[PDB]
């Protein structure tokens, strides 16, 4: 009873060449496409790169593979994958893809009496995701998937999602787990791009990336912030206490300048400045402000001595106001 | 004599179609997995992902490869492995499964006279153990470990575990040992689940992970437990030492800034805080607060030098027994 | 009606031996090389090496190949790449060079009626580019790609760039963006080399690479900058305060030492000074120059204050001026 | 004069099963294994794994390879070795295994007229090494190498070594060469482990490492050392300077804390103390403890001063000796 | 035309063994070794490895591949090297070798009517070069490259290489480029090593290192001579300013201490003193001396103010002189 399926499928490759699309020199071939992302690798914002374990499956139709018996339907694995056609699909934007071949090889293959062919098959994808830390860390980020035919242009093969958006790429709900973003949505879209081998059409997936914040509150912020509050506290020091003063004064200004080379040591060297930077280079004016005025106070400390105490008296007012101030306006224009 | 076992294995390979699994169309085939972890490999928390070298081994019948002889079994290897069906099982969570190919492909096959296969591989898995580190380093994880059939559904294939719990999954005495993990238990579920493929039925193998602490004591802990005693010495220096009391102040608040950053380094760059954050941050507040406390005392040194010894003689009691009393709190919490 | 491809397809590869190239012992074979760069790889400066990502195609003529049909193309895949003849192609230059597999091996095939061949392949290259880093990061790099026969030497195969430079080496617009360089443009050669296997025609690309700086401005120039203006800061105050001028002195001195040991760790470990190296060192000099300007200064306080003063006072408008004029030779002769 | 070679191994080959061993169903296989070590790659503590590599041969008796030539002994390749049958033996410690492949796989394969078979195979182990670093670094480690048979048990396979011990296991004079360790001998054992799928023997090889000292005296101890002699020089300064003798206790304190840091970042994450930690905890109390005599001596300079210089001149003397006696009794202790 | 080179093709291949060396049991195989390296790659001191990129070139004779046609050489590719025989030629210190597959395998075939054969492969070797770092980093290195047939002994496969040594090893002009080496040259030679399997010729190529220096003078050198020189300022300083000259000599001990961590960081881990630890142990003697200095004047700047000021004036001197005096001995000691 079960050398009936022999029988089938040793008749359709039967004068059956794998080298040549369906419906060749007829009409064009048609290729529906879903993807199922079961985990969404981590994003190196180093390397611009954002790694993805996806189940990647295309369904079309081929006449060659009609047959007629008892079952309409025909799982199979990945043996008859390389005896059939498949199309020629790769990742543009993928540096580096590799399959999974354990325990055996990640592929599935399905034939109807119609003849429409579903390959499934699981990927891990190293894409390329280039990103705009001008914002930097309040920055969100468009991470996309671009894929189609490498040698069957639009006039042969065309790719087109099936179903709606939603149904056409389906994200795990424990897969998109990120340390340091969080996975708003996902688009869908399409486009045909011009080469000198033709025409070809390409899908297109991106993914809404909003990075989430808390990290660096507690690794740069925070620091930075007591840094400064820590500086003002100079203000509240008799001046004739030179050393004292200039211990408070020294140390902040150096310990922020470590500070900045510590945070841009995870961040990419991008050749320009971030928010973050810039919110650096306020809490370093507010420190090195602070050692200029105990400078001038100390050297206008004997001739006019009244207006040394009324600069250090005010100082202890204006320096809070003005630091505090400035983070509403900061953070505000960044979470706007 | 040795010829005869020839012919027998010839004649099984005869008329013998590996594309089809056995009882196609007539039953549902029927697997038996068991599993030893000859080593639970490192886990990787910045990575969110652990290594585990295990001998997985498949059972199931197929009648096709009845046979007659002397032997009631027929020990072989890897070479018959690729001529019979064997199931496409794969693991939902593998990040990237690798084979032992040294000497020889890690492989066992094994055929009794009933049709019972017994297939067992070697495998190293780096899967996926997402973390939730809210109680970090009293912290306890639930690394998972899914695999089940890629092609064919509960309707076609079944996978069910052999004989007990404690059978089904065995761990090396040896390989469960981790520089920052205690092995307490392995537990086993199952659980069927609905794609657009078919329904699954998923194996699942959970290892339960008791983090073990003493590292992070000698790392973090101490270092600010001493910082915060060594801050509190300023209060017994007398107040005219300005400059003195200086030094412990600011030099204790930069060493607990450049603790957390240090700290935060091998720990995963996750978005909140932990319990060894909230413990840097009391012992910041302590620190940073004897220096406010000498600030104060300083500013009031002449107008009012009464109360200034009050609360330096004071401050020698309260700040200890406040830092003692916490550290009984934290400790008796996350111990609890 | 398909059955005609299978027909020419199979009568081509009749009588055909793959390990003889076209036109052997009746002329020269001649190859067309075109590429596109779809994203110029990161550079490694530590190791001199710079990624990239081409679709490298390749065109020659094959009398073998002749056919006749009602289609003029025959659009194809990697599976009738190996069954033909194709050169030799190799990178003299590439480290390390591995082609993408998934979904499918990224390779195309097309014949026409005449006998012509366009062999399409997608490659990751690791190459190699030696720089000069005398004038850095006011330095230009050229790297290079060198690619050519193995086996077949100027005799038997030369390679030609098809139309015109613009044509013959295309780059994606987002392909050229790079954290520390900008891509200028491209240019494209040939030359002859001699080998003890006989002579070899070689196809040279050079990617035009001119460094954008502001990372290393915002990481070491300014800290250098405001280090050196901190010491100044001790001009300002008496000369009796002896241990707060030694506080700025001794903390820029070590300031200036460590950045100078945090600058080269990025960058690679070459035997020679830099321009970022004169530099730190110019700055290293104010800096310990002012420490040697207040220890003059307090050695004579007593003898002589009437000359202490006066160095004190002159030492406030003199160090800035010689700092500010050697920014303005210093940025001026490496940015003209 | 050379086809008769051809004709025998043709000859040997005809009516030939790879996939069944010899002597099966009449006798149990006999196997001899004989190692040379060609050098024994890194030791990584942090891993807990070592890499070495071997020329691994193994000897058996096949009565299916008898021939009658003019030649007593057949050297070959690895062409053949596939053709015939040979062991299945793996690395059961052997976290990750490669072979090497250039110019040509690295195996040899000498057959004999009686049948007895030489196989040598290279190898690249990268086998696991459980340490127990409690006397770090005055540790001794016996890192383990454990092979046999995957598939065939005890009952048709048996491991067994040639010869003595010696000849058994032999390491290259240069090869047993390493940075932070020393290859003081080796040792081989047998020993049968049982399993669900039968009874098998285990050829086990220890290598004795005694760890050198010398990088870590110049690395941690030294500085400790140094550090704590730092401290003991504010014993001589007068007590009025606070200032002074305040940067003495804190700068070491802060010294000996960074460098417990450092010294466990290369060491594994152990959740232990090791030898080295208590030397650097008790060098930790001297130089905290200084400080608390500075504190303890200030805070009674006023009331009676008597005790407070009998207590700094004393303390010149009591912590120069306990710091050196702890030595003696450290060193000697795990020195001997 | 071109048919007539398939008969030859086919002609050879016809009654060949590729399992069998030419002139077996009638002569010994002589192989003629040629090597050029297309580039030096970088030199691991860490792990004491170095890679090399080469095309290595094998010659010998085989009377099986005699030919008559028009011409007299049959130029081709790797596609035949695997139907005929080629010498298991490998590298006994390579740890890891790979070779170069895109876009075809880098291998080149010839043959001559009289049955000469060239084989080239190019080849990446990931070779091992042990060090004796007692002279660094004034040390010269001499890395060997080791190379001979793993299965044929001497007595079968000899060795030896072809012309003079200028010939037999190349090295391109811009290959040979380090950041931190210099080859001064190439060596060649040959040895006969017996073993338990036979007795195997060697063929040995060595390669001379001279280390460039100047990455550590500005890396380690410069800071340690200028931080002495800081700490010698203390000596101009008056005795009175005990806060002053006491941050000298705490900042400056702790800088050298933490410059030799730094230093080894990037040296490999071996346990013995280097030039350059001795250099850093002087100048670390020199500061600490220093210190030892100002705290003997001022325990005696009471009691014998008159020689305190003797010491202070005399040291402004000595030390310098020493110091100075040190340098030259040791630079000539080690340039010499
Ligand atoms: C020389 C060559 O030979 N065969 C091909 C080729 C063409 C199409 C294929 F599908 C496969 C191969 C080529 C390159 O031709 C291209 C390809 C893509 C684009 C293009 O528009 N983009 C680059 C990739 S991208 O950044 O994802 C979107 C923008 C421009 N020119
Ligand atoms: C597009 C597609 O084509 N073939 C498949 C497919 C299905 C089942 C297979 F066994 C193999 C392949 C798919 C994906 O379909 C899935 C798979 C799993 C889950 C699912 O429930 N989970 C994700 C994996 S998990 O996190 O381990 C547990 C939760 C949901 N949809
Ligand atoms: C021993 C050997 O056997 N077959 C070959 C060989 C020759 C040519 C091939 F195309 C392939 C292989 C060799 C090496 O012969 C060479 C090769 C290149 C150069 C040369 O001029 N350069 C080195 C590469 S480069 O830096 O890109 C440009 C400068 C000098 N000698
Ligand atoms: C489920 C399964 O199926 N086939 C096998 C299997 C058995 C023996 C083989 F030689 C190959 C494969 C298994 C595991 O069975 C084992 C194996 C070893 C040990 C054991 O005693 N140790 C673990 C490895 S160890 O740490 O080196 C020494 C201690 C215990 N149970
Ligand atoms: C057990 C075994 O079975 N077949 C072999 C074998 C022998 C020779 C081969 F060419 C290939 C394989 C072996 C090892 O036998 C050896 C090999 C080399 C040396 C030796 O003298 N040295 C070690 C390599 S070295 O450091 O480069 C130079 C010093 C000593 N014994
Ligand atoms: C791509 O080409 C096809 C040709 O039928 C056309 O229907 C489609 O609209 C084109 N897509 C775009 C985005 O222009
Ligand atoms: C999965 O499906 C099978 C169908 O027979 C059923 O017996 C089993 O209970 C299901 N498992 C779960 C967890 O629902
Ligand atoms: C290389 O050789 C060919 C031989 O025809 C010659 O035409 C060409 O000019 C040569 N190229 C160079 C750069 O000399
Ligand atoms: C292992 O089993 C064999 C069976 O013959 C026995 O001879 C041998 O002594 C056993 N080894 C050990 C260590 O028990
Ligand atoms: C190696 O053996 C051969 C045998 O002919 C001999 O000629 C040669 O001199 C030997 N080489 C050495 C270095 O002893």
Known sequence: ????????????????????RPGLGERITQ???????????????????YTIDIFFAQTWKDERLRFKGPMQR??????????????????????????????????????????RVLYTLRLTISAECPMD??????????????????????????????????????????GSRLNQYHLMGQTVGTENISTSTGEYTIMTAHFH??????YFVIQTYLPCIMTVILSQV??????????????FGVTTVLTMTTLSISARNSLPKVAYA???????????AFVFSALLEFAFVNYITKSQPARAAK??????????????????????????
């Open 1 to 20: 009873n079960i050398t009936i399926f022999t029988r089938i499928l040793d008749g359709l490759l039967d004068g059956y060449d794998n080298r040549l």
């Open 31 to 49: 290729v529906r496409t879903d993807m199922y992302v079961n985990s969404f690798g981590p994003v190196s914002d180093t390397e611009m790169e």
């Open 74 to 115: 025909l799982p199979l694995n990945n043996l008859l994958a390389s005896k059939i056609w498949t199309p020629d699909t790769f990742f543009h934007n993928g540096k580096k893809s590799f399959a999974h071949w354990m325990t055996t090889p990640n592929r599935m293959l399905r034939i109807w009496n119609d003849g």
């Open 133 to 174: 830390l001008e914002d930097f860390p309040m920055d969100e980020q468009n991470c996309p998937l671009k894929f189609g035919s490498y040698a069957y242009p639009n006039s042969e093969v065309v790719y087109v999602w099936t179903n709606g958006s939603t149904k056409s790429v389906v994200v795990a709900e424990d």
């Open 209 to 214: 990336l909003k990075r989430k914040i808390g």
């Open 234 to 247: 100079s203000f509240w020091l008799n001046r004739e206490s030179v050393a004292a003063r200039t211990v």
């Open 274 to 284: 971030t928010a973050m930077d810039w919110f650096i280079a306020v809490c370093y």
């Open 311 to 336: 600069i250090d008296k005010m100082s202890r007012i204006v320096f809070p106001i003005l630091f505090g101030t400035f983070n509403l306006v900061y953070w505000a224009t960044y979470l706007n």
